[PDB]
Enzyme design. Structure first.
Site, PDB file in Angstrom:
ATOM      1  N   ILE A 169       0.746  -1.177  -0.045  1.00  0.00           N
ATOM      2  CA  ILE A 169      -0.108   0.050   0.159  1.00  0.00           C
ATOM      3  C   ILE A 169       0.755   1.264   0.208  1.00  0.00           C
ATOM      4  CG2 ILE A 169      -0.245  -0.022   2.540  1.00  0.00           C
ATOM      5  CD1 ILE A 169      -2.956   1.024   0.076  1.00  0.00           C
ATOM      6  N   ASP A 170       1.884   1.251   0.878  1.00  0.00           N
ATOM      7  CA  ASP A 170       2.819   2.620   0.880  1.00  0.00           C
ATOM      8  C   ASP A 170       4.292   1.981   1.433  1.00  0.00           C
ATOM      9  OD1 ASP A 170       2.317   1.798   3.840  1.00  0.00           O
ATOM     10  OD2 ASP A 170       0.321   3.023   3.392  1.00  0.00           O
ATOM     11  N   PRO A 171       5.314   2.486   0.743  1.00  0.00           N
ATOM     12  CA  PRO A 171       6.755   2.146   1.177  1.00  0.00           C
ATOM     13  C   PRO A 171       6.748   2.074   2.511  1.00  0.00           C
ATOM     14  CG  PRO A 171       6.579   4.173  -0.080  1.00  0.00           C
ATOM     15  CD  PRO A 171       5.385   3.832  -0.175  1.00  0.00           C
ATOM     16  N   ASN A 197       4.141  -0.873  -5.308  1.00  0.00           N
ATOM     17  CA  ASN A 197       3.571  -0.076  -4.282  1.00  0.00           C
ATOM     18  C   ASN A 197       2.553   0.748  -4.794  1.00  0.00           C
ATOM     19  OD1 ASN A 197       4.387   0.740  -1.539  1.00  0.00           O
ATOM     20  ND2 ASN A 197       6.739   0.660  -1.967  1.00  0.00           N
TER      21      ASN A 197
END
EC number: 3.2.2.27
Lengths: 323, 935, 216
Positions: C65-67, C118
């Site tokens: 979803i997010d780094p 991502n």
């Protein structure tokens, strides 16, 4: 979850082998197709249990096989070949023999150079197979591939049938074999063309006939009773009296359980010689008028229907008197 | 300590809580915090064998568990249902439990919290303050909602805060973006608790030269560069964008009761939050009433379809994630859900909601004065239109005439408004409000002071439209009615479908009848006809399908069996055994439609000796709606006239929603037999009426009804005699020809074709065709479609031409109710001639004697000469089409034309004459004229 | 390599990203000014390094979803020292199909067939889901283009991925998952792994060899 893995693996497995699947199998097929799309957005007769154990053991003797090709012909569960990716036919046949199953024998002249099957290579093959079983099969096995391209020999022609009756297949069991025009009783293989298919007597019907045996030929474009034939149709005795019939049914323990779980239209069309296929297509074609659960009037809008009503009233009455 | 409940909400955090926002008598708001549990209905033996013991368990008595799986059967030996009777208990679990073979699992924990504790969600209570310990100012804690909500007092009145807002943004694309385009204006309609209605619009400084900013401050406005510098009493305020957004954030964090806006969830609030984050790096903090949980404003979607195929469109509705009790409402979603209008722009919605009539007073060059009064035009319409005129600027006359007002006068009753429209001959004109013809895109390229203030007006009117519409739709009372009929919180009332609202009434029922319906078997679907199409008086059925599920006693738990027959000669045996066994009138055998071939019977048998859950539900709903209709007929206050109207409408909506809920697979009322049954009983009843309605009447007291009044489904000895004796004047001749109907209508062809002779005869027939020809609870009603109202197609394909109850000195109107030809994105050139072609199309269906020759030669000559005259003269202007561009070759036999005048109308010109063939009785002239129209 | 206005002033990509890459330029240009208003992680120099990886030879996307806010690398779940949180967890929970336990590294960027993706190509260092507003459009576009060349999607997330079908204008086999960022890693009850294999057969793709990605 693992529970989902169960039905997913089942979906894949059955999808691999639709060709040999059952009705509940294709049911699970479509049900799991839907259960997958809504989460990720995109036959033969009965085989015994003493035979089911041996069959389950033989499916494991060579896991390259998917199903057990059991030829269900004339109430005989005779197989012609076991389709196993690596297993030879003679080994599975010897296993089945040690288990007590029907394996055939091969008698033919082999050639080191493959010649195209023709008049000779089919007629002489049928005549040399030397198998005393009723089948038009001409059988062979080639080393290097398991594919099956069978051959046979016959000629299509016309003849006028004799009646809609039966020939004694087993003990007190007369299975319908519509006798050919020359006199022979045809060898009907599958219950499709074996119940009453083209019951029409004296009708100029086209079939694939040979010198001794034959097969039925379907069209290309446009397409004899009494109490006697009830008592032997569930195999209790021979009779001509209703009291005798009901008493012999009382003397039985499993026959009563068999009658209890069947309808009377079924039982009266099964013991008469045309259970369902085109029967209902005609019984819907007729207006009816009954009373006290006994047909008394009919009007068209096959041939064994008057006698059929006569035996239907009888089976209804014996069922009422017994139940 | 007396309170009245405004809203119920739950805390979405580590701790589960349930909050009650309520107003005391003196206008102070108090919150109450209840521990929120999970609820499981478990038999006695299961309860005794629970490990670990449950947190709390309260008895429920002996409930009968009924297995309602429908099993088809091929003979008439059907085993009766499996019905146990066990001592049940209600388990209250703080943390969710996986408990096996627990039943009544389809009901939410909020419904349980209401029912088990005996709490209506909208009632007004006298809370026993002995339990409500105090946790912080304005918040109490209630551990025992049973003994604290015991004494229930009658409903009193409370004050309610509001905030209706709207913004406008700079743009040159079709829709602006939070990064490139700043917001120009920001209007509000702040209604305090005390009643102070304050309007004010904030304007963006940074699009103005400092010279014009000083000119505006000189003119009338205020200037602020801080947050504590503004006051809502000033009607215009100039500021930067940072202070504008900080004021927006300061408002949205207040504990208003409602925050209404039209499509302000997708656009307005989202734009404000995003832009505030970009500019200042701040967010809008919604704090929980106990101050122990703070969230940030963030809009979330909620797809609504209870069935989604592949590559479709579901009405995604955006919601705010606030947790302080304020009901962030969005009129756009509510209006799309509740009513199926023609379009859903604010302009058209208003134009069809706020209407009135205006009589010319004194014409003039480019001006015209209209008066609208109560004593002249429909009572209440003038008052609401004068409530809308206080802020509006562009009034719309009957059609396509948008006029900027010049001066408005709000009398003590009515209104007088001057319009800048050219002179018009007729004295009366219907005034609707709102289309606002402005080139905002162009108005932004030359932004200066006058345009800034013009747009500030444009925006404050749009912020107040969301109040006029919020009062028009009575949302504040429909909310409190729905939150009591459906036992739900005031916030979850319009958010869900029927399958969710129906579970409060149903659960309240199953604890009286002490039943528990279970299904230990899966269900199979069988597709069906989801919509009917079809094509004189009009009598309709009194809520046909609830009356049918009450007549036939249809239900899942009162089904004896579905006796099916494979093919003929078994259907007959089974029919005779179903005539002897299962005899009328305790059992009813209905011939449903076969569920799968080969099958020809599918008879369903319903036992009519005990009232099922569904018919008892429907009877309670009908009884309560009738009680509230009565109490509204006698209402004296103007507040009760709204409360009872809302309650009646709510019961109507929840009753009409049950039939569709029986054929819905994943529903708490599913039963394939009953759904397929009431569809067949109703159809049989409709066809029965149609059978006996084609009868002539002469020598008064005949009305032969065309057939014997034989009751279907059984004989009943009800004086079966076609000839009846009516009570109208003696010498008459009228026959009623064939009647067609769909399910809620039976249109009978009266051979009079005139008012004052049908209204009376029909009002006396309807009393004689629902007391002498209908049987148990199948009542009827009456209306009249005057002079062949065009019946193009199924229901929503007609004109209005209303004649309801009076026909002597009565006022009919014939504008429209089509909702089929009103939408743009189509041509503008040749059609709209219907506005001139209707006066000869409505007049070719209103003759009766010369009608035939006139209509045939009229359609023929008219259409051929229209073709030739458009091809030769080039006359029709470019105004509109009005049907729900295109290019086509004209060389053979922005919307601008070409050089040959037969470009793109050769298809509509035949589709039109195809639509209008089913209003005559000619079978040779009509179809042959149609065939020859192709050449 | 298209030349954008703001950092990194140009985006070199792979030859299979041109069906999208053009409008990505304006999507990034209208948001860059506020995007680089704060130093993010990955740094503005490796925002689109995953745009170098081809999509022809890939059939599975393990969409995060997010780094990792603490210096992700522009390739999802990667680890220059194999000391992160979720990557070692998924390597462990996948050490059972292959049956081996010896790994010095496990990046999904070397499992031939799978592509770590991502969703939000950036985040403010130290914070999570903090640059969603800047990315929504380009994130939806890149995902829609990643799914039109492959067919499987394993969203490693419990509630972050809830309306994924809505943000995708075409039907693609949208498997879901449960974010092992939680306690107990929640990967034991659900056997998410090897479901991708089963689903890669109904159109005859090869199963993923999750052993192909360890370091030996």
């Amino acid at each position: 979850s693992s529970a989902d893995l169960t039905n997913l693996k089942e979906l894949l497995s059955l999808y691999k082998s639709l060709r040999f699947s059952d009705s509940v199998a294709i049911e699970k097929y479509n049900s799991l197709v839907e259960w997958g799309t809504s989460t990720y957005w995109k036959n033969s007769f009965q085989i015994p249990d003493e035979i089911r154990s041996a069959c389950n053991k033989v499916l494991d003797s060579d896991n390259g096989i998917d199903f057990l090709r059991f030829v269900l012909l004339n109430n005989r569960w005779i197989m012609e070949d076991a389709i196993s990716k690596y297993q030879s036919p003679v080994n599975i046949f010897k296993l089945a023999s040690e288990y007590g199953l029907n394996i055939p024998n091969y008698l033919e002249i082999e050639i080191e150079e493959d010649t195209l099957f023709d008049d000779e290579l089919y007629s002489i093959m049928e005549r040399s197979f030397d198998d005393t079983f009723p089948k038009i099969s001409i059988s062979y096995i080639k080393l290097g591939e398991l594919k099956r391209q069978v051959v046979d020999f016959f000629k299509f022609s016309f003849m006028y049938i004799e009646s809609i009756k039966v020939d004694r297949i087993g003990d007190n069991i007369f299975i319908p074999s519509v006798i050919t025009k020359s006199g022979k009783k045809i060898l009907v293989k599958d219950v499709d063309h074996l119940i009453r298919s083209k019951v029409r007597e004296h009708t100029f019907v086209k079939v694939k006939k040979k010198n001794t045996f034959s097969i039925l030929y379907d069209y290309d474009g446009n397409g004899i009773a009494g109490l006697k034939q009830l008592t032997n149709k569930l195999d209790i005795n021979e009779c001509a009296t209703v009291d005798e019939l009901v008493d012999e049914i009382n003397k039985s323990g499993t026959v009563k359980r068999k009658i209890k779980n069947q309808s009377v239209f079924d039982l009266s069309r099964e013991c008469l010689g045309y259970p369902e296929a085109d029967f209902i297509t005609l019984v819907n074609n007729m207006r009816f008028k009954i009373e006290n659960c006994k047909v008394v009037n009919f009007n068209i809008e096959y041939g064994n229907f008057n006698q059929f009503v006569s035996i239907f009233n009888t089976v209804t009455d014996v069922k009422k008197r017994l139940f | 300590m007396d309170v009245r409940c405004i809203n119920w909400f739950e805390s979405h955090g580590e701790n589960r809580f349930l909050y009650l926002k309520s107003r005391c008598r003196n206008g102070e708001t108090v919150f109450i915090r209840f521990p929120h549990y999970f609820y499981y209905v478990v038999t006695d033996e299961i309860y005794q064998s629970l490990s670990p013991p449950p947190f709390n368990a309260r008895p429920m008595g002996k409930m009968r568990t009924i297995d309602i799986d429908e099993t088809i059967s091929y003979n008439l030996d059907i085993k009766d249902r499996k019905c146990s009777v066990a001592d049940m208990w209600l388990i209250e679990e703080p943390k969710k439990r996986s408990i096996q073979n627990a039943t009544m699992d389809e009901f939410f924990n909020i419904s349980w919290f209401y029912i088990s504790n005996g709490i209506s969600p909208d009632g007004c209570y006298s809370l026993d303050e002995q339990y409500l310990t105090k946790i912080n100012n304005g918040c109490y804690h209630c551990d025992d909602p049973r003994n604290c909500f015991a004494k229930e007092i009658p409903r009193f009145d409370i004050p309610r805060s509001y905030l209706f807002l709207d913004i406008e943004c700079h743009f040159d694309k079709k829709f602006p973006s939070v990064f490139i385009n700043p917001i120009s204006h920001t209007s509000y309609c702040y209604i305090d608790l005390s009643g102070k209605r304050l309007l004010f619009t904030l304007i963006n400084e940074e699009m103005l030269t400092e010279q014009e900013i000083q000119e505006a401050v000189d003119r009338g406005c205020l200037r602020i560069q801080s947050l504590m510098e503004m006051d809502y009493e000033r009607e215009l305020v100039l500021c930067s964008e940072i202070v504008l957004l900080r004021i927006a954030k300061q408002l949205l964090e207040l504990t208003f009761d409602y925050v209404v806006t039209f499509n302000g969830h997708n656009f307005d609030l989202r734009y404000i939050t995003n832009r505030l984050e970009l500019l200042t790096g701040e967010k809008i903090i919604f704090r929980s009433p106990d101050k122990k949980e703070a969230v940030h404003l963030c809009i979330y979607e909620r797809n609504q379809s209870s069935h989604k195929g592949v590559c479709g469109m579901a009405n995604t509705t955006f919601h705010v994630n606030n947790n302080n009790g304020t009901i962030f409402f969005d009129l756009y979603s509510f209006i799309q859900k509740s009513e199926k209008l023609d379009s859903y722009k604010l302009d058209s919605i208003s134009k069809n909601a706020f209407s009135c009539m205006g009589k010319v007073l004194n014409r003039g060059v480019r001006e015209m004065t209209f008066i609208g009064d109560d004593t002249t035009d429909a009572k209440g319409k003038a008052d609401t239109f004068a409530k809308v005129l206080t802020t509006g600027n562009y009034v719309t006359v009957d059609e396509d005439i948008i006029c900027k007002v010049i001066r408005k006068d709000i009398l003590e009753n009515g209104f007088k408004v001057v319009l800048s429209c050219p002179t018009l001959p007729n004295d009366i004109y219907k005034l609707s409000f709102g289309k606002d013809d402005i080139d905002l895109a162009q108005m932004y390229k030359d932004y200066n002071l006058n345009i800034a203030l013009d747009m500030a007006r444009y925006c404050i009117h749009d912020a107040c439209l969301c109040q006029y519409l919020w009062e028009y739709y009575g949302v504040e009372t429909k909310t409190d009615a729905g939150a009591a009929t459906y036992v739900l919180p005031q916030s979850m009332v319009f958010e869900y479908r029927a399958s969710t609202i129906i579970k409060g009434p149903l659960l309240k029922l199953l604890l009286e009848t002490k039943t528990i319906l279970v299904r230990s078997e899966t269900k199979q679907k069988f597709p069906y006809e989801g919509g009917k199409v079809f094509a004189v008086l009009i009598f309709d059925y009194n809520s046909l399908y609830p009356n049918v599920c009450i007549f036939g006693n249809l239900s899942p738990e009162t089904l004896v069996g579905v006796v099916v027959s494979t093919n003929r000669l078994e259907e007959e045996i089974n029919n005779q055994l179903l005539l002897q066994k299962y005899p009328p009138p305790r059992y009813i055998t209905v011939h449903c439609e076969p569920r799968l071939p080969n099958l020809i019977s599918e008879i369903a048998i319903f036992d009519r000796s005990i009232e099922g859950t569904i018919p008892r539900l429907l009877r309670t709903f009908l009884a309560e709606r009738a009680r509230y209709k009565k109490m509204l007929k006698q209402a004296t206050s103007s507040t009760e006239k709204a409360i009872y109207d809302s309650m009646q409408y709510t019961y109507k909506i929840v009753a009409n929603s049950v039939y569709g809920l029986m054929g819905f697979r994943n529903s708490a009322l599913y039963s394939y037999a009953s759904a397929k049954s009431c569809t067949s009983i109703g159809r049989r009843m409709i066809l029965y009426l149609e059978s006996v309605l084609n009868g002539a009447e002469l020598s008064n007291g005949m009305l032969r009804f065309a057939n014997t009044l034989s009751n279907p489904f059984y004989m009943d000895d009800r004086d079966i005699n076609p000839i009846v004796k009516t009570s109208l004047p003696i010498d008459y001749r009228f026959r009623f020809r064939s009647v067609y109907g769909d399910t809620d209508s039976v249109f009978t062809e009266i051979d009079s074709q005139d008012v004052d002779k049908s209204i009376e005869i029909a009002k006396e027939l309807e009393r004689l065709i629902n007391s002498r020809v209908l049987f148990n609870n199948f009542k009827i009603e009456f209306e009249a479609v005057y002079k062949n109202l065009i019946m193009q197609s199924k229901k929503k394909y007609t004109t209005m031409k209303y004649s309801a109850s009076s026909n002597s000195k009565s006022v009919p109107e014939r504008i429209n109710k089509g909702t089929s030809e009103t939408r743009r994105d189509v041509s503008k050139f040749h059609k709209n001639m219907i506005k001139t072609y209707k006066t000869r199309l409505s007049e070719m269906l209103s003759e009766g004697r010369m009608n035939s020759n006139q209509v045939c030669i009229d359609i023929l000559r008219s259409l051929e000469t229209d073709l030739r005259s458009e091809f030769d003269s080039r006359s029709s202007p470019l105004e509109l089409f009005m049907l729900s561009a295109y290019i086509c070759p004209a060389n053979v036999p922005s919307f601008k034309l070409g050089s040959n005048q037969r470009i793109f109308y050769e298809v509509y010109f035949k589709r039109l004459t195809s639509e209008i063939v089913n209003l005559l009785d000619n079978k040779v002239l009509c179809i042959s004229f149609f065939q020859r129209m192709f050449g | 390599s298209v030349t954008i206005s703001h950092a990194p002033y140009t985006i070199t990509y792979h030859d299979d990203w041109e069906p999208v890459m053009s409008q990505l330029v304006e999507f990034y240009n209208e948001v860059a000014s506020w995007l680089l208003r704060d130093e993010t992680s990955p740094i503005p120099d490796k925002f689109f390094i995953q745009l170098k990886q081809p999509l022809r030879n890939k059939r599975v996307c393990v969409c995060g979803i997010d780094p990792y806010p603490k210096d992700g690398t522009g390739v999802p779940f990667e680890s220059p020292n194999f000391t992160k949180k979720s990557i070692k967890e998924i390597a462990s929970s996948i050490s059972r199909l292959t049956g081996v336990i010896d790994y010095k590294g496990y990046n999904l960027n070397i499992i031939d067939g799978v592509i770590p993706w991502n969703y939000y190509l950036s985040c403010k260092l130290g914070e999570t889901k903090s640059h969603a507003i800047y990315w929504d459009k380009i994130s939806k576009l890149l995902l829609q283009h990643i799914t039109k060349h492959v067919s499987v999607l394993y969203c490693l997330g419990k509630t972050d991925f809830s309306n994924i079908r809505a943000k995708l204008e075409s039907p693609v086999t949208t498997i879901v998952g449960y974010h092992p960022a939680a306690r107990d890693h929640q990967f034991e009850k659900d056997r998410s792994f090897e479901i991708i294999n089963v689903l890669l057969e109904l159109d005859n793709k090869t199963p993923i060899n999750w052993a192909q990605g360890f370091i030996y």
